Structure formats: C-alpha cells, structure tokens
Amino acid sequence: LGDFMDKRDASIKEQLSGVKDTSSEVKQLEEQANAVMRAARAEISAALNKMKKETQ
C-alpha cells in the first residue's frame, strides 16, 4: 500500500512537472520564433540598405 501511495503521488507530481515542463518548452518555442522572425526582417532591411547604398 505504501508503494501504491507513492506511485500515485509520483504519477501526479510527475504530471505536474511535465505540464510545467511543457509550458516552459512552449515559451521557449515562442521566443525562438519571435527572434527568428525579427532576423528575417532586419536582415533583409540591412541587406537592401547596404545594397541600396552600393547601387547609389
């Protein structure tokens, strides 16, 4: 019975941690996506400027 109690409690605590783990993983995913999108935009802008300046 002691083992059963432990198993159930661990299963629940583990579920909470995983749920906590998943939330952090999704926050990281969102941050990475945001950073990547910024790079695209900024990168291209810089490119044109440098390219625009060279053309000029």
Partner 1 sequence: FNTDILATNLINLSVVLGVLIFFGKGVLSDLLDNRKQRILN
Kindly state the tokens that stand for 9: 């409690």
Task: Work out how close the CB of 11 gets to partner 1 at its nearest, in angstroms, rounded to a whole number.
Answer: 11
Exactly one of 1, 2, 3, 5 binds partner 1 (CB under 8 A); that residue is 5
Cα distance between residue 14 and residue 20, in whole Å: 9
10 touching partner 1, by CB under 8 A:
no
Cα distance between residue 44 and residue 56, in whole Å: 18
Looking at the Cβ atoms of 10 and 39, the one nearer to partner 1 is: 10
Q: Which residues bind partner 1 (CB under 8 A)?
A: 5, 8-9, 12
